[model samples]
Every structure is written in C-alpha cells, then in structure tokens.
Target chain A: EPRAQRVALQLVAIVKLTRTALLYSDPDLRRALLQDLESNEGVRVYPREKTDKFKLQPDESVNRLIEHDIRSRLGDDTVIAQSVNDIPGVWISFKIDDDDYWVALDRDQLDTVT
Target chain B: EPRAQRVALQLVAIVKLTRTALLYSDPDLRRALLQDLESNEGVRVYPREKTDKFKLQPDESVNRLIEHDIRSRLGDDTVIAQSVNDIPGVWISFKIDDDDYWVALDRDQLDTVT
Candidate 1:
C-alpha cells in the first residue's frame, strides 16, 4: 500500500500570455494605450511616464529594454540597443481596406494580455 | 607528469561523490545547472529556456519558501515546511520587495548552507 502527499504531485499549470498590443507613431492619441500599460505589473513600460519631474522621456525605461527589437521588427536600419530579454513582448497585425500595418515588439514595448 | 593523471582521475571521484555533494533533479536540470555552474565559473542563475524537463514555477513568491524556511530556523512555526532534518532537497530563499524578492538557488540548498 502507498500514500500520496495531500497536495497532488500533479503539475501546477499556469497559462501565461504576454503580448504587445499596439504601437503608434502618434504619442498624442496613444496616451490611452500607454495608460492601460502603465500601472499593471508595470515594468519599464515603467508606467514610467510618471517618473519625470520635467516630463521628458515618457517611457525611457521601456525603451531602454527593447528599442532595438522595435526598430528591427518595424524600422529597417535596425540599430540594436539591446537589453535583457526578460520580457517577451509581441506586436503587429492591422487592416484598413485589406492593407495590413503593424509594428510588433518585445519588451521595449511589452503588453500582457490578461 | 605521471602523478598529474592521479590528480585528474581522483578529481572525477570527487566530482562523483559530489554525487548531492553533485547537482543530482530535475536530474537533467541538476545536470544542466551542475555542468554550467561547474564549467562556466562566471555568474549565477537566470535562464536557459527548455533547460529543464519541467517548466519552472514562479518561486510562487518567496514569502512561502523563504519565510517558511526562515521561520523554521528561528523559533515557532518550526513545523510548517519541515521535510527531514537534512534529507537534502533544500533551497535558499529571500523575497524581493521594493527592495527585491530574492531566492538564491545558490550552490547549496541542503544541509548546513554554510
């Protein structure tokens, strides 16, 4: 005869879905998107627009991590400003009249789709 | 010149005795962690995806692992996370606060962490 620990040795499964929702050239209107990302488990996205006594770089810490992954996945010249890829982010996929547009990212601009 | 073989061969014996005194489980994990720690000689733990047979769990926050262990030591609550006095399978813990939640899965986990 055998006994098992009260809590089953079964796997404690976790479903993690982290993504980058969008990227915008117009920071003016994108304030809402940034707003959504700011406070939640907030990382370099620092939600950091908060850190400026002088209102300078809104997402400096955000950009510090993945600005390059941004340019490479979006822009062409591809200057890589690297950082620890601790955060895996994603972006892209849009359509207006069947012409798709997107600039997906990892970490520089991370989004966690709960 | 000839005695050097004796030293090298005996070192393998030491390594084998290091047998817990080796990183012995997720045994593959122990292998990877062991080999890397044994070979690399540079830094500490972080990541190597798919390195373990099982996916890593978020230390579930150190409050449980470390605090339980911490409480186990001082006085009181000496009963909660008790396994065997020194049957092995030990881990080091520290929870990161604004300070930093930390758990050093350092070289030693079992026995006198000294």
Candidate 2:
C-alpha cells in the first residue's frame, strides 16, 4: 500500500508539472503535445465535447495523504485525482486553459507488486 | 512580468516537492517542521478554529501561467495561490493533514524589479 501510494503521489506531481507547462505554452504547441501524448502513451486530454462522457467518482480515501500533500504544494484547487470506471489505474483531471481534461495511467504505474 | 511569473512557477514546484516530502514523514517530524516554519517565517497552518477568520480571494488571473504549470506538475487540485487582502505579496494555502494552512511569501520572492 505504501509503495503504491508513493508512486501515485509521484504521478500527481508529474501531472501538475505538465499542467503548468501547458499553461504557458502556445496554442499550437499545446495541441501538438496533447496529440503526441495520446498517440504515444494512450493518455487523453478529452475535449469539451467528450469530457462529461466518462464515469468518474472521487478516488478512494486511501489516497487522502497523497491528495492533500499535492494540493498544498501546487497551490491549485482545480486539480483532481480520481478513478474512471472504464480505465485501469488512476485518472487525474483538471481544468486546462478553461477546459476539462484527463490524464490516464496504467495499473502498472501504481502496482508495485508483480 | 515574465520574471515574476517564473519565480512563481518555481515556487509552485518547490511547494509540491515539500508536500511530497511531508507525506512520507513521521508525525513528530511533521510537527517539528511546521513549528519551525511558523517560528521563522510567520506562516501559519491555522488549526481548525482559526481557519475561518481570514479573508481570501481567488488570486489574480495574471498568475494563470504560473498556476497552471504547477498544477500539472504536482497533480493536486486543492492548492490555491492568491493574495490575502492584508498581506503584501502572494499567499498560498492548502489542506495539511486535514487542517487549513497558509504559506507566506514576500514581494521579493516574486519581484525581480528593484
């Protein structure tokens, strides 16, 4: 549990970093980067047309420690780390340039035990 | 503006890193660190009782570039970077161990202009 939480926490930090980078990026750069991400990694930053289509719930309370810590550090309240029913691992979503977006991660990212 | 924004962005990264460190720390260590921060910096993580007294607003939109970068990098949504009406520079706040906490930064931290 501790190991999974640790990795999950790290993923949160990485996600925030990406969000910040995208904020300052030009429109073309943002589009290209998102496209590249979806193509190579299967992570999708869904457009407004598709955002609400997924089923999302508050992630487990087991993630409280990780959740609270990241909130304090990044100074952003719009970020959310949660579970998407159709996805395997954690799905973190946030408002990117005023649109809702999601980043998908595989169970392997959080599964420390093989 | 760019310089200030850059510093703000770096601060967000640092805050997130600190948040991650506090997560894996022991209780005593957390206490000591919070106390130390309060003593030296005058920043407070108000206990539940005092949290409601402060007047805070959504921080400036000018900070979008800095704010968004940190959120994506850190992956926590509960973070807010803003100005307290009475405070001179920026004030950041987040939930720390279920308590509302605030971080104080001086103008020089965001000011590159002399």
Candidate 3:
C-alpha cells in the first residue's frame, strides 16, 4: 500500500494545465475558441459537440509542475487544447519542427485545423 | 514540411475511492460507485488484484458522479457488461457476494473469481 498507480500512461509522467489562458478556461458554454492557442504554427477548430472534457484527476503538485515547465520552456508557445476549457489534460507544446518546431495533431488539436 | 493527422482515445472516469496502495479511500465509495451504475450505462467493476492497487482512484463517489454524468450524456441507463481493461478510465469496482462470488482483475485482463 505504498506506491503510485499504473506504471504510467500519458498520465504516467503526470501533466497538468497551467498557463494563465487556462485559469479562466471553460468548455460548457463559451468554448475555448480557435484563437486561444499559443501556437501559431498550426490552427484547428472543433465544434462543441465533437469535443472532449477533462477533470482534475491527479494531485495539485502535478499541475504545478506543468505550469512551471510550460512557461520555462514553451513559454507562451504552450497552448490549451480547445475541446475543454483550461483542462490541462489536453493541450500543445513545441517539441521539434523537424528542426525548429513540430506540429501536434491531437484530436483535441483538430478544432480550427478542419 | 511534415503534416499528418493522428488519432487516439481519451478516457475519463469519476468513481469511488476504495483501498489505496499509498493510503487513500473515500468513505462514500460505495454510494458513488452505485450511483454511476445506472441503466445500460455499460459498467465494469474493478477489484484490482492482491497487488494491483492504486491503478485508479478508489474514490467511488467521485467516479460515480463522473461516470454517471458521462453515461447520462452518452446513452440511456447503465448496462453491466464486458470488461474494458484496456481503458484505464473505464468504470471500475468490486465487492464479494455472500461468499458466493468475488474476484479482482490484473493488467493482463485476468479475473480471479472466488
């Protein structure tokens, strides 16, 4: 009775929604919008009906880490996925552009793209 | 110059918190789990193996509310059916009958019934 759950999924590393954009993010009525992304590298749009929602499932510290890291590295480049408000569960960041930037195409990222 | 679309699933469940490996449990576990077990909701009870605790939050109350909400939106009533071990966020729970039936599951999808 003294260990973490599951070896780890995407949640194994434990990511959380940080950025200020998420502080006021909401998905029930207004929607996250096609212009809220931090990445101009790509833009996608999704309707509310085809969207997914996220809830706080892990510890707060995990969220803290995401906030701290998202800024330190991706800076304003980090974006909250549009499906759900500021739910850190789905979002984007810059990894490698084959050289300078990489495009993320998650279902949550599919909104404005279409 | 590389752009391709990817597809994946996102599972999210909110249920009871029973025994935990690192010490966790919600007194309202059963109440929560049962609440989510609605009509044709397609549920799966997770009793986790003797050593497989902490795989998911044992917070059954939380799970019930969350899963119940998910079901209410997806279909109609909840219908107890097959296991979806592949999905960590799947509805999970377990309790033994009057010494008649009781068992837990393993990652390998093994159900040790009693």
Candidate 4:
C-alpha cells in the first residue's frame, strides 16, 4: 500500500510534466506528441484493448519526422534522447536544443499523450 | 518511452478492473470503495498536493473495519489476502467469502480509485 501510494504520487508528477509539455511545444510538434500519447498500436496503450478504439501506436516513423524537423529547424544536438529507469516503469527523456527542455513520461502517460 | 509505455498499458488494466468492480458491487460497499479512492492523506495520493486538495489516506482503519464485518458475517475463510508484486508497485489482494472475489491495484490507480 505504501509503495502503491508512492507510485501514485510519482504518476502525478509525470502527468503534471506531461500537461506542462503540451502547453509549450510547437503546434505541429505538440499535435504529433499528442498522437503518440493516445495511440494504441503494439503494446503502446495500456489494458490492450480487444478492438482498436483510437489507433494509438508508437510513432517510430513520426519520431523520425520529429527528429528531422527538429534537427533541420534547430540542429542535430537540439534534442537528446535519454532513459530514466530500467524496470518497474519506463522513462523517456527529451532535451531541447540549447535549453533545459527535458520532459519524462512512463509508458502509460506516453500512451495517453493525446 | 518504451517502458513508460508499458506502465501505461498496465495502468489501463488496473483501471478497467476497478471500473468493472464498481459496476457490480452493492451501493454501500461501492461508496466506501470510491471514498477510499480520491482521498489524499499520508503518502496515498500521487503528486502529493502542496495543499491537501483531496485528503486521501490509506484506510487501514477502514480495512480493519471491512475485515471485521466480513469475518463476523461470513467467517474467517471469507477473504484471503495476497500480494501480486514487490518492487515497482505494491499490490493488496482481497477475496470475498466463498467466492473468487479478488482485485489488485498499484499506488496510482489505488489513489485514483474514486
């Protein structure tokens, strides 16, 4: 129970960061990010639905698009990919070019991004 | 992002079960369950509110109360307690008397039970 409580608190932090990120990113980028969040392709979405409700899936292709756009618009070193943890949960960290624009989310938040 | 994605999927499973349980239980029991959720006290709620927004705390006292009533009405074998996992999450298992009524939740889902 104690640990569950702790995880819940951590999730709250994740959700807050996610909401904040949505507020500042470029519209196109934000839209892409949202699409990534709400997609349920492969093991992306939680509770793995029997039927595809939202067509949400990891956008490796879109990630490429983002990387290309960000790199071209900003630079190659503009955003760096980082990993936060290994087990219990997954964390993906993104840093903006020349700024402390880093945000992390677990699989669930990532799946529910939109 | 992969790991965050995994946790999100797991969370969806937790939420679906929770919602399902709510749909079948008695009104009083359901009310208690909802109250247990959504309340923030101690380390129960995630993203611990700087100000107590929801006063949710682990209802150990309430747990005892439920155990007492169930034991008195249906006898000791009514509910069997079990744990699902140790790290990355905490799971509390409850079983109803003479029935296969067991459910589990992680800290975040537990916090948002209501």
Question: DockQ for each candidate?
Answer: 0.01, 0.02, 0.01, 0.02
lDDT of each: 0.25, 0.48, 0.28, 0.35
Report the candidate with higher lDDT, 1 versus 2. 2
User: Candidate 4, after superposition: displacement of residue B10 in Å?
Assistant: 2.6
lDDT of 2 by residue, A1-114 (tens): 463454444555446534543444344455765665455333456543344445533566555655565455544563443445455455666665567666665555333211
CA lDDT, candidate 1, residue A105 = 35
Which candidate ranks first by TM-score, i.e. highest? 2
Report the Cα lDDT for residue B48, model 1. 21
Tens-place lDDT per residue, model 3, B49-83, is: 44343334345434434445434533343321123
User: Clashes per prediction?
Assistant: 11, 21, 42, 26
Over B7-86, each residue of candidate 4 has an lDDT whose tens digit, in order, gives 33343433333333333344445455444443421111121112312222245544445344434433464331323222
Off-target runs (Cα >4 Å) in candidate 3 are A1-73, A76-93, A96-98, A105-114, B1-50, B53-62, B67-114
lDDT (C-alpha) at residue A45 in model 2: 60
| Tens digits of lDDT, candidate 1, A66-95 | 433333333443222222122233322223
Between candidates 1 and 3, name the one with more favorable TM-score. Answer: 3
The C-alpha local distance difference test score for the whole of candidate 3 amounts to 0.28
Model 2 chain B lowest lDDT segment of ten: B40-49
Ranking under TM-score, best-scoring first?
2, 4, 3, 1
Per-residue accuracy of model 1 over B62-90 as CA lDDT, tens digit each:
42444433343332412222222232222
DockQ of 1: 0.01
